Amino acid sequence: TSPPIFSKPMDSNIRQCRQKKKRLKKRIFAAVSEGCVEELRELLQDLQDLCRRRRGLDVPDFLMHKLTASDTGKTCLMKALLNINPNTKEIVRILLAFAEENDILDRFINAEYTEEAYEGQTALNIAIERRQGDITAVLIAAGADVNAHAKGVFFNPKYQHEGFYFGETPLALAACTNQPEIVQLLMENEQTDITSQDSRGNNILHALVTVAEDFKTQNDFVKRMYDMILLRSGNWELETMRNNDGLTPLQLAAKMGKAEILKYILSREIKEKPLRSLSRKFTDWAYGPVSSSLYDLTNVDTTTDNSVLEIIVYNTNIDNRHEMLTLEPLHTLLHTKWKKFAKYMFFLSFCFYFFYNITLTLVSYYRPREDEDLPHPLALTHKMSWLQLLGRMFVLIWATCISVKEGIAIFLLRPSDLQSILSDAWFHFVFFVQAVLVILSVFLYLFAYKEYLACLVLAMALGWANMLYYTRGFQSMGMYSVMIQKVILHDVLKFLFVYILFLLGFGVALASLIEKCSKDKKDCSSYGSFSDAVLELFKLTIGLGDLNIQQNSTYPILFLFLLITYVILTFVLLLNMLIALMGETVENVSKESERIWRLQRARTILEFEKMLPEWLRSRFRMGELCKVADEDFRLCLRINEVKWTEWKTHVSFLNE
Amino acid sequence: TSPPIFSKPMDSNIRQCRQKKKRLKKRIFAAVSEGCVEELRELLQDLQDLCRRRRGLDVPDFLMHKLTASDTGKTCLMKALLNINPNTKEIVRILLAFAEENDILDRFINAEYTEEAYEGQTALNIAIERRQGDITAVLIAAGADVNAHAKGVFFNPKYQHEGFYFGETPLALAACTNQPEIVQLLMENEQTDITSQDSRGNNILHALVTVAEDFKTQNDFVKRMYDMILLRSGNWELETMRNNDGLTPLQLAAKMGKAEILKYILSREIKEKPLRSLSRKFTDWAYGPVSSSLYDLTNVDTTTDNSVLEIIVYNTNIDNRHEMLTLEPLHTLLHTKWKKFAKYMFFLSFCFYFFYNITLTLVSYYRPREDEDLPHPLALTHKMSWLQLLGRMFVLIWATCISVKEGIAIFLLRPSDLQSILSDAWFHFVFFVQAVLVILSVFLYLFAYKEYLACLVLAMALGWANMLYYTRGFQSMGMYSVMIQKVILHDVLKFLFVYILFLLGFGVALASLIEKCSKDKKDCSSYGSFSDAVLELFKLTIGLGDLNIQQNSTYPILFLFLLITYVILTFVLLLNMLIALMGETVENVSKESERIWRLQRARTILEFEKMLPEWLRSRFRMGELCKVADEDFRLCLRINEVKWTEWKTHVSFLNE
Amino acid sequence: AAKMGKAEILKYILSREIKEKPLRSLSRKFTDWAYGPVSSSLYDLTNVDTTTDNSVLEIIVYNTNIDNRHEMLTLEPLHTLLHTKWKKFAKYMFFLSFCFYFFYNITLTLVSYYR
Ligand SMILES: CCCCCCCC/C=C\CCCCCCCC(=O)O[C@@H](COC(=O)CCCCCCCCCCCCCCC)COP(=O)([O-])OCC[N+](C)(C)C
Numbered sequence A, B: 001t002s003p004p005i006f007s008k009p010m011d012s013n014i015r016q017c018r019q020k021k022k023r024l025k026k027r028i029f030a031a032v033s034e035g036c037v038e039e040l041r042e043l044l045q046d047l048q049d050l051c052r053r054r055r056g057l058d059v060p061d062f063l064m065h066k067l068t069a070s071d072t073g074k075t076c077l078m079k080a081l082l083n084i085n086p087n088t089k090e091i092v093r094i095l096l097a098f099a100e101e102n103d104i105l106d107r108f109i110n111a112e113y114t115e116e117a118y119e120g121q122t123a124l125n126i127a128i129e130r131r132q133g134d135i136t137a138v139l140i141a142a143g144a145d146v147n148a149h150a151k152g153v154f155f156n157p158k159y160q161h162e163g164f165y166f167g168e169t170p171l172a173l174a175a176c177t178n179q180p181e182i183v184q185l186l187m188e189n190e191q192t193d194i195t196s197q198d199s200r201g202n203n204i205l206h207a208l209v210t211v212a213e214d215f216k217t218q219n220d221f222v223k224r225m226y227d228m229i230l231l232r233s234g235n236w237e238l239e240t241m242r243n244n245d246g247l248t249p250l251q252l253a254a255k256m257g258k259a260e261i262l263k264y265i266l267s268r269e270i271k272e273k274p275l276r277s278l279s280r281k282f283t284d285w286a287y288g289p290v291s292s293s294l295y296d297l298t299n300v301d302t303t304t305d306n307s308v309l310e311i312i313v314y315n316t317n318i319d320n321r322h323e324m325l326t327l328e329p330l331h332t333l334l335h336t337k338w339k340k341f342a343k344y345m346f347f348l349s350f351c352f353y354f355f356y357n358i359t360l361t362l363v364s365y366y367r368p369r370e371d372e373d374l375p376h377p378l379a380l381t382h383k384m385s386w387l388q389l390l391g392r393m394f395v396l397i398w399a400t401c402i403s404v405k406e407g408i409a410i411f412l413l414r415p416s417d418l419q420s421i422l423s424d425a426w427f428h429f430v431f432f433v434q435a436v437l438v439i440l441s442v443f444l445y446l447f448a449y450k451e452y453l454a455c456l457v458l459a460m461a462l463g464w465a466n467m468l469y470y471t472r473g474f475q476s477m478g479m480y481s482v483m484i485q486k487v488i489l490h491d492v493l494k495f496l497f498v499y500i501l502f503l504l505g506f507g508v509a510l511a512s513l514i515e516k517c518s519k520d521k522k523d524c525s526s527y528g529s530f531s532d533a534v535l536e537l538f539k540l541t542i543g544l545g546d547l548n549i550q551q552n553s554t555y556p557i558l559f560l561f562l563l564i565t566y567v568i569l570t571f572v573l574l575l576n577m578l579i580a581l582m583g584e585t586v587e588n589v590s591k592e593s594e595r596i597w598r599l600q601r602a603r604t605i606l607e608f609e610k611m612l613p614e615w616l617r618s619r620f621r622m623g624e625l626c627k628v629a630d631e632d633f634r635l636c637l638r639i640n641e642v643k644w645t646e647w648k649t650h651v652s653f654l655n656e
Numbered sequence C: 001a002a003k004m005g006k007a008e009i010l011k012y013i014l015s016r017e018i019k020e021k022p023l024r025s026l027s028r029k030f031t032d033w034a035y036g037p038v039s040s041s042l043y044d045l046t047n048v049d050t051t052t053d054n055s056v057l058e059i060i061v062y063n064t065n066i067d068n069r070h071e072m073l074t075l076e077p078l079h080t081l082l083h084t085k086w087k088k089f090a091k092y093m094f095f096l097s098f099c100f101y102f103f104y105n106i107t108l109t110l111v112s113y114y115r
């Protein structure tokens, strides 16, 4: 979006527009940047000769105070590794030779910035970045600590952009930057503690998830370097370590939205002998096209919180969702729930809520409308032993079940779901106000304010408008509720803005040309008030009003000019762009409507699972226990899938 | 669609979560799976030493009872050929060495499952599947019967998916799996009986049809392996053997819908000397572009039942039909019938049925409408010697010819044709009810119930609506009847569902705001009843009613709010999506309308052929007799086709 | 280059960097530090900004017969120097015109309609 702002840059080439201490520092920092090799041995010989004319037991502290910048913590060796020259291999040798003779060596190698913006960045981070593996091998031989954590403002941005975040450790920098050979050069060195956490709490595997691309692209160098480090560890320690916000690297993969690393993590099978337990897919038999598989689902099903099925559905800012739902343990565990408990509970809602409106409509439409007997037609009003009184009791007790439950569902809703049609925020607002106006019509009848009938008529209106919610069961009618809502909130709300300006504008312009015919008693014009003349232009938009242009008004030609100017501007011009602008939109819905429906069916599957007791939820608890190795008890989900179109491709290529 | 369910898997690697007999069996079945070669010779030496401490003449039965699983019939050698190792070549030698010393050998080789799900699967089937031709040559040298039929639940699925079906024989498994070299290795072995039938009755050639793809694709390994086996046989025995359901492999090719094998089978020409009779296309002379050909049509024309011209037209679930009709003996034998008997009989129906409605309309419209003389205007009612009485007799006798014949055509109609526009199921339902209401109007006039005129008016309505059927003769008007029926049953029936909810909803909502003006005697509102207020909203949809909003009703502002809320919801919003959703549909018809018309003309060609006597059908019997070889009498169809655009391509490449 | 409309030579002339020793001054783009993806740059803008007449930002906007304009506005010293002006003085002055001219018509309409 917008570029960031950093105060001091990391290394500057351009000069911007005591002295003996100023004489000697800058001549070292400049000469190390172009790499004059003779100039290094001149200054450093005089520098140790300078420090002899200084108090002992404070001579190493004065020595580094020459070598260091004052405002930033950068030393001499850091600028050398930044500014690459052919003369680097000589001056690195001398800067290691000068550190040997004194006690400065351990202080010199592990130097970091003390600057607030770039803190912690050691010399070993700089050698890895510039594609210099051989200076990196010497700094390891010099004894640089490989657990160096560079916590800083620049190394921890608050957004995705405005910074660079890799994991604050030299092993994560090696793997994110497409550098294979440095990784085994660091991992086979036994002093490297792999399992260690940064300021965010991430280990090595969380970082590689955050540097991927969700699209399937040409090269996937964050995917293969994820794999090389995992097998070399050979344990479940890197997989199940959980960060500060309580996510594992599979649960983080669904959170960020990376839809290609996540396809790998489900479908791992390693079939060699010592590396057997790392697999999450187990194939037990195959025969031609047919193959059976046992998926793991230890953290996929909803038996625990923050499951990777719950994260995909209920969370937006995940841009691509439907490409994640079509994965194999995710597609089956929605479809297997649909045939067992979920298709009947959606049917029982449509039976009661359609029998709720028939009981509401007949009560209001056949009510006593005479003043001599005006009961409330609901809630019995009296004691008459009237027929069908299992109905009027049924309206009121179901009106509280809708009011309270959606009133809970209003509150427990994040601000992310308010701004998208993909989320069902809009239906909890329309079912709720239908429950309010019913119980208010009993509440306003009782206190005798006597506006009760207006709220009950609006209750019968929205009571049949919300029957369009239950069309999301079919596929042929499920697209027709989505395609309406992609037309209203996109385009039609841009139409009713501009059309008001032409309605408001000519509304006063025609009202000012008449003198009041209510003084004339004839009511000759229908354009008397502003509220009348606006209405007579609305009938001229649909085609309902009549051009009674024989008019006893001041300047009747100008009154006839503006009516023709109105019809050209808004009947042929604006209303036939709205057909031409909806035509772009409806074709853009029809290609991708089948994806949006399967999401909005997969939201009411997981809601009806949460409305279950614990025994009945565990009655439909899918999966069995398995023993796939020595000392192992895992969960399984047998899928006997068959692949005709893929098997013919594999067997055809093998001969030729 | 949905995956299948099988009880016991074929071979399991994963353990699920007397003892001396339990001690020795599992140590054989495990050691044969990883292939420790020393462990085999330890157990089998002790096993024959174990059987000596057992009753003689029951020693081989006890021996196999160790080697076999109890619940399934799988033996030791089957798990070896499944679990491929580098140590298979040793343990196959020893398992053949151990079978030699006893009388177990013939029992050991031909072992099958006795399991219900996987019955009949021998060891020779398993060696072919794992791409192991060399173990297959040894098992033939061991003496495995090649006629092994594996009838089973898994080897015979009821659908296309949920199983694997290849033909239940090791020759069909060799050919379906893209394995050329094993085929001649089985066919040149003289013990292989090629002509043999499975549970479905199929021979070798029926199976290869059922494993193809109807699309023309990159590789066609089921097409070439069909050809290699046919010439090596060199006889008409494999072609004309007919299965249990009475189809030949050409008639089965049209039934399943495979449209690429079928193109090959028509156009075969083999021009070598001993292989001459197998061809179905005969070229006698050619000269540049022009070439003449004699097609075979022994089982193509409709002179016998289940002809391959009758199967394509009258049967659906064949997805692609029009790509099959454009083949060369199928395209000519429809077009040659169109110029001889079929274009006149379609003309004679349009002449009579248009002269049937003029006689019907003039009789009803110029009837005696006075009460002083009210005859039935048809069927003479009297004896007056009235003029033009060759007309009223003509209506009634033709009304029975329509009623009975379509009433036969109602019954003899499969449930497959009821669910598609491609089938003419809908026209037999509308011509039939037009014949009923005419003969009922004479039947209801006679018994003096006196509702006769209502049925006769509906008879005049559908009598001109069915004249849209006879537009299928032209091409310019033939698309316009198809494009109507792809708009009604797709989209408009989804419109009249949602529009009812907005009509039903505001119908009660506006009816509840008025007190009954029939008590006021003025009839001031047109919104009195529910049946009135729904009608006044229907006129506001087209543009016919008038917004008489000056209304003496309770809360007149809310009555004015809902009318504007109705017009926005359904005149600008819903009715202009229906134009925008028909626009997707009509362009999707216009590209493929020319294909759907040629099918619906090719249905009334074969119907008018069935309405012929035997002499007049044999009068137009196409084709002559031929003698294309020694002792041969076949049918022929000479086509002198010319190919300019193909001949220029062939002759241009030949120089360069 | 902006006058005639040539939109490919102009992309080169902005983004020249020569890093050899005697040929240093000819560059109009200066890179001072980079680290992985992040890179900083100093553009020249001696004749790009509107501090003088016939600037190459004024020629692109106010002159037609330049067929392709929007491919020229997306260049890097031209895209930033429009967006940086939008957050400092330009978005408020467009807001003050919409406030006065909408309060100009309400004062006009009420005066004529209630006359
Ligand atoms: C498909 C939809 C599009 C079709 C629209 C086609 C365009 C319009 C089509 C037809 C317009 C109607 C023509 C009839 C004229 C009325 C009669 C009349 O009064 O005569 C008057 C002259 O005529 C006028 O000057 C009338 C004033 C406006 C008429 C149109 C002018 C331009 C409209 C806006 C231009 C575009 C604005 C927007 C730009 C995009 C003189 O009257 P009189 O001398 O006093 O005596 C006559 C007696 N009488 C009054 C009883 C008769």
Ligand SMILES: CCCCCCCC/C=C\CCCCCCCC(=O)O[C@@H](COC(=O)CCCCCCCCCCCCCCC)COP(=O)([O-])OCC[N+](C)(C)C
Pocket: A496, A499, A531, A532, A534, A535, A538, A541, A575, B557, B560, B561, B564, B565, B568, B569, B572
């Ligand atoms: C191209 C098609 C689209 C264009 C449509 C554009 C939108 C509509 C365009 C124009 C609407 C017509 C305006 C005229 C008002 C009537 C006069 C009146 O009664 O004044 C009343 C105020 O006004 C009202 O409140 C009337 C009630 C509803 C009017 C519209 C409200 C929102 C409609 C639904 C919103 C969207 C719902 C669906 C969401 C998608 C007050 O009356 P009074 O104080 O008692 O005294 C006046 C005396 N008299 C009554 C005799 C006059």
Ligand code: NA
Pocket: none
């Ligand atoms: Na119209």
